[PDB]
Structure formats: structure tokens, C-alpha cells
Amino acid sequence: MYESILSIKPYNLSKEQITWVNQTLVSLSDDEKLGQLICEIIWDKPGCDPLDVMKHFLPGAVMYRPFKAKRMREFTQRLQKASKIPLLIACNLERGGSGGNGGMEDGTYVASPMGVAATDDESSAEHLGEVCASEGSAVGVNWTYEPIIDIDMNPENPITNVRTYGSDPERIIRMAKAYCRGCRKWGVLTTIKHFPGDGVDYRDQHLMSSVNNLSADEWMDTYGRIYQALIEDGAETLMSAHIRQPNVTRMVNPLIKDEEIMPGSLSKELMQGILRGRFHFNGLICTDATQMVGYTCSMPRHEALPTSIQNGADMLTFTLNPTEDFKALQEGLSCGLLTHERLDEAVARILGMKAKLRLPERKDVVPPLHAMERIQSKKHKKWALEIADESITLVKDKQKGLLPLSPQKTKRIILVQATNEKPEGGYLSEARLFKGLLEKEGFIVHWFEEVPRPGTGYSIEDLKRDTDLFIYYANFKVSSNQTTIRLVWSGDSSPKFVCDVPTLFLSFSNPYHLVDVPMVKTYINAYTSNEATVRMMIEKLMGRSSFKGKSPVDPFAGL
Ligand SMILES: *[C@H]1O[C@H](CO)[C@@H](O)[C@H](O)[C@H]1F
């Protein structure tokens, strides 16, 4: 059975592969089928054993948090050889081998997706995807939870922002298809997220069930257009997140009551009515992480877990208390919250992706050790430099004669770090590098914290005697469970003397900082805070490299 699913896009399995899926399915107990539904998270901290993911059930997949590539490779061998059914092994490879709170600790940090989008060259996104999948597959990853095809409509949203390809649906489609092309070259499944679409609300689904409140027609013309394009392009998997679309839900079910409207991860109207029905998506649907507030607050958990599967999800991403969660699935199956027929259909789509990857027939469980040499390879580092060269964007340049910088125009610089990270020693490694590279050019550079500021004992004339230029290094990065990535001062260090001392503002992440420093006359978006982008920033400030980036978003955010 299931030939109508498994023989067509995005599965395209052969007769013999479908026979393996069916024979395997029939051989599984209900407990084993329920376990296939679960992806378990894995971390590398002493006292934590990866095989703990198998103490309470036999999972269908795992996801690696960021730890070292060599440990990931060892974990893959241990996990797979201990598993009767091969595992899907997922990773949040968002920005290359490393970067963005996902990936691996020591992979290549290429760029944020928005930095890639600023190049306006889809080859940049293809290269991004190649790095992610090339470095991931070397250590055993076969599933990247990317690309993000959210639209960065709302500039106050803290969980979209540089994780997106910006606010233009046509560019999102171009870039996401290219990212997927790069991944398929290395045998890694992709995941379009976050369905039904982040970026309309200004709130984080990590902390609540956020709401895409476009009209049904508006949603269909934007998010629906993007999802349809990636589905037709062959997207293998899709992540249903803890976001509501009430107006689309009511289009499917006009009589639904407000309290019955569920987020994507729990919604039959969105997963079965829209995705399976209207869009004929035939790939694997997984939930976003189930311990997040957007999920937990929407429904009692014991009902929610089987209901997600019944309503169209094939896989639950992560457990809270694993004994309790598995018991909830067992009881949901026995009492009819989850049907045996829907259980078999979910597991068929899980096993089908394992057969698509040819995991059952793989003699070795990881590639040869030789494959590890791709990680931080010269090719990958080179692509990161090219993308930085093409991405950095001169947004506002209303300071006559400021650029290019020269020690003979502005010898003494005060460097002002602004960030929501908490690096040991107070200063970001990348800002230290930037400071050192300015000094190499011949500038004298002090941190804001090292020199006096105007006050009862120090005047603005003193400041002007001691300071020729202020430079701001702003890195307000996305991170789960933040309600803002707005500029926060750590407010005397803000650009409060722009008419008395020339001030230059550099953002290495959030592209909307003109919201909080509108007085600034020269403003540059770099989208990514890594070594490659810092070095290329220096080249461009000194006038040895042109500014080539094009804003993939409106950096002024409506003035
Ligand atoms: C929910 O969690 C999953 C697994 O880490 C991420 O891929 C999604 O971006 C997040 F929304």
C-alpha cells in the first residue's frame, strides 16, 4: 500500500523501496510505530548520554544541537548501529556548518540568510546550501531543518529578521530553491519552515502562539504562493509551527469557533485542508519543537501530542518529559485520539524518507574520514568571503566626505559595542578583530568604556579634542525566547553627539537599527557578525572594496 504517496514527488521510490517500507511497517509493534513519530534532541555535555534517547521508546529521528563535528560523527555511528530502524539525523544548519545557534560548533559560518539575500545572487544561496549539506553530511546529518521561507514583513518580529531572505516573496522563492539545490547535491533532505508563516506578527512563537492575521486572500497571495512554489520544486519535508492563521482556518471551516482555532502544529484545517488538500503537499510534515510555549499553551499536552499526528503531522519534534509524552501517545492510540490508520500513514511517510536516503542499504553509517576535510575547507571559507563582499549594504550616506575612512581625516576613534550577547571579557571576538584591523590601518581606537564622556568634569569640547570619529558595532542577534532584538544600551553610549562628532553606525545583524538610531547620518548593514564580514567591512570602509549589497528589506521600517 501507499504507492500513491511513495511513488511520486518528493519520494519517487522504486518498487523494491516501497516493498521495504511496507514490510518494515507491518513488522513494527504499535509501540515501535509510536516511537518512529518522535524526534529526540541530542546535546554533548558530560553526564549526558546520547543513547538516552532510546530508554523510553525507539525514536524515528534525532537532532544534534551545536557541538563538535568529531563528536557528531561519533554520535552518528553509535546511534545508527544501536537502532533497528535507521534514524533521520537532523540539524539546524541555517548559516553554513556553523552560525545562528544551530549547526556544529566548528563548522564554517558563511552568512545569515538575509546577508545571502542582500547579494541578490541565488548562487550565493546555492553555495550556502552546499556548505550546510556538505559539512553536515560529513558527520552523518541527513536532514537540515531549512530553508526558512518566512517573509520578514514585520520589522519588530525578533525571530524572523536575518533568518529570512527578506521581505520580497519572489526573492525568497529564488533563494530558497537555490538553497535546496545545494543541499540535494549532498543527499540531505530539506525542510521548508515555518508553516503557516512567520513574519506578520511581532511576537515569538517560542513564548506564545503567534498569529498570522492576513486575510485568507492576502495570505494565499504571499505565503501560499511561496509554499506552493517550494512544494512544486520538490521540498521533501515541511515544519508546521506554533503559529495560527485564523482567517485561512475560517476559509476552510467557516463555522469554526475562535477557541477551536489551533496553530499549524495542531490544526487539521491548515495541515490537511490547505497543505495536503489544496496544495497537494506529499512530503513529510514535522512539528516545530513541542516544548515551546506556542505549542504547550494551546491544548492540554496529553491530548495535543496524538492530536498533532491525527490532524496531519507525521512527526513530533522533541519531548518534554519523555515517559509522559510516550504514554500520552500510547493512550491516544488506544482511546481513539489517534487512529491506527493514521499512525500507519505517518510511519509510512517516515520510513519512505529513510528509504529515499537509502539508509537501510548503507553498509557504512558515516562517510569516510576523508569527508571531514570538507569542514572549514578553503572552498567554503572562500564562499563566505565572496558573500560578505557582495552583501554589505551602504544604506544611508549623508555625511559628506566621511567615506572612505582615513587616519589623516579621523585619527582618533571611539568604538562602541552594542550587543545582546554576553561574551566572556565583555567584548565580542569579532569586535576585537575589527578593533585590531582599524589599528592596523593607522587609526587610534579606544573602547567607549576606556575614555571619558561629557559630564560635570569633561566637556563636549574636550570630547572633540580627544575624538575624531565614533564607530558603532551593533550585534543584536536572534535567539529563542527573546521578545526583542531592539537596540538596548549597556544610555550615555547611544549616538547622542552626532552633530558634534562624526558618527558611523555598523549593524552586523539586525537590519532595522535605524529605528533606534535615526539621528545617525551614515549607516551600513552587514547582516552577519563573523570574521569574513568584519574583514570585508574594513576593506570597504577604507575604500579598497566597493559597496555592492542591495537591501532585501526596507531598512527604514516606514521611517
Ligand atoms: C522550532 O524548533 C525547530 C527544531 O530546533 C527549529 O528548526 C525551528 O526553527 C523552531 F521554530
Backbone dihedral angles phi then psi of residue 125, each to the nearest 5 degrees: -70, -35
Q: How much distance in Å is there from the Cα of 289 to the middle of ligand 1?
A: 6
- Kindly state the cell numbers that stand for 455: 559630564
Strand partners, 244: 211
Closest CA to 419 of 411, 407, 431: 431
Experimental technique: X-ray
Angstrom distance (rounded) from CA 424 to CA 477: 17
- Spatial distance between the Cα atoms of 237 and 192, rounded to a whole number of angstroms: 7
Q: 441 in helix, strand or coil? A: helix
Exposed/middle/buried for residue 360 (C-beta within 10 Å: 0-12, 13-18, 19+): middle
The residue whose C-alpha atom lies closest to atom 11 belonging to ligand 1 is 288
The string of DSSP codes covering 280-317 is ---SEEEESPTTSHHHHTTS-HHHHHHHHHHTT-SBEE
In angstroms, rounded to a whole number, what is the distance separating the alpha carbons of residues 348 and 352?
Answer: 6
Residue 92 in contact with ligand 1 by CB distance below 6 A: yes
Atom of ligand 1 nearest to the CA of 241: 11
User: How many Cα atoms sit within 13 Å of 149 on the Cβ side?
Assistant: 34
**Cα of 144 to ligand 1 centre, how many Å?**
11
From the CA of 240, how far away is ligand 1's center (Å)?
10
Ligand 1 pocket, residue 419 CB under 6 Å: no
For residue 468, indicate whether it is catalytic: no
288 lines ligand 1 (CB under 6 A): yes
Phi and psi, residue 419, nearest 5° = -160, 155
**Residue 295, Cβ density class (10 Å: 0-12 exposed, 13-18 middle, ≥19 buried):** buried
Distance 34 CA to ligand 1 centre (A): 21
- How far apart are the CA of 318 and the centre of ligand 1, in A? 10
Neighbours of 513 (CB within 10 A): 25
Kind plus residue range of the DSSP H or E element containing 39: strand 38-42
Nearest to 149 by CA among 212, 207, 192, 87: 192
> What letter represents residue 192's amino acid?
I
Q: Which of 540, 418, 407 is nearest to 472 (CA)?
A: 418
Nearest to 138 by CA among 378, 386, 385, 377: 377
- Classified as helix, coil or strand, 173 is helix
From the CB of 194, is ligand 1 less than 6 Å away?
yes
> What is the 3-class SS of 504-548, one letter each residue?
EEEECCCCCHHHCCCCCCEEEECCCCCHHHHHHHHHHHCCCCCCC
> Which of 160, 159, 135, 126 lies closest to 66 in space, CA to CA?
135
The span from the CA of 547 to the CA of 537, in Å, is 9
* Separation in Å, CA 132 to CA 97, 138, 403, 425, 512: 5, 10, 35, 31, 27
Contact 432, 531 (CB under 8 A): no
Establish whether residue 242 lines the binding site of ligand 1, counting it when its CB lies within 6 angstroms of any ligand atom.
no
For the chain, the straight-line distance linking the first and the last C-alpha, in angstroms and rounded, comes to: 58
3-state DSSP assignment of residue 149: coil
% helix, strand, coil for the chain, step of 5: 40, 15, 45
- What region, left, alpha or beta, does residue 399 occupy, with left being phi > 0 and alpha being psi -120 to 50 degrees? beta
Paired residues of 316 in beta bridges: 38
Q: Resolution of the coordinates in A? A: 1.9
- Cα–ligand 1 centroid distance for 465 (angstroms): 51
Asked if residue 145 has its Cβ within 6 Å of ligand 1, the reply is yes
Distance of alpha carbon 64 from alpha carbon 377, whole angstroms: 22
Residues 446/504, Cβ–Cβ less than 8 Å: no
Per DSSP, 42 falls in state E
Cell numbers for 183: 543541499
30 vs 33: CA distance, rounded Å? 5
Q: Is 243 in the pocket of ligand 1 (CB under 6 A)?
A: no
Using a 6 Å cutoff on CB, does residue 314 contact ligand 1? Answer: no
Round to whole Å and give the CA distance between 406 and 499: 20
Give a three-class secondary structure readout of 197-259: CCCCCCCCCCCCCEECCCCHHHHHHHHHHHHHHHHHCCCCEEEECCEECHHHHHHHCCCCCHH
Whole-angstrom distance, CA of residue 66 vs CA of residue 42: 9
Instruction: Choose the catalytic residue: 120, 201, 204, 288.
Output: 288
- Which protein residue's CA is at the shortest distance from atom 8 of ligand 1? 288
Q: Could you tell me which residues are beta bridge partners of residue 284?
A: 237
Residue 157's Cβ-side half-sphere holds a number of Cα atoms within 13 Å equal to 26
Annotate 242-275 with three-state secondary structure: CEECHHHHHHHCCCCCHHHCCCHHHCHHHHHHHH
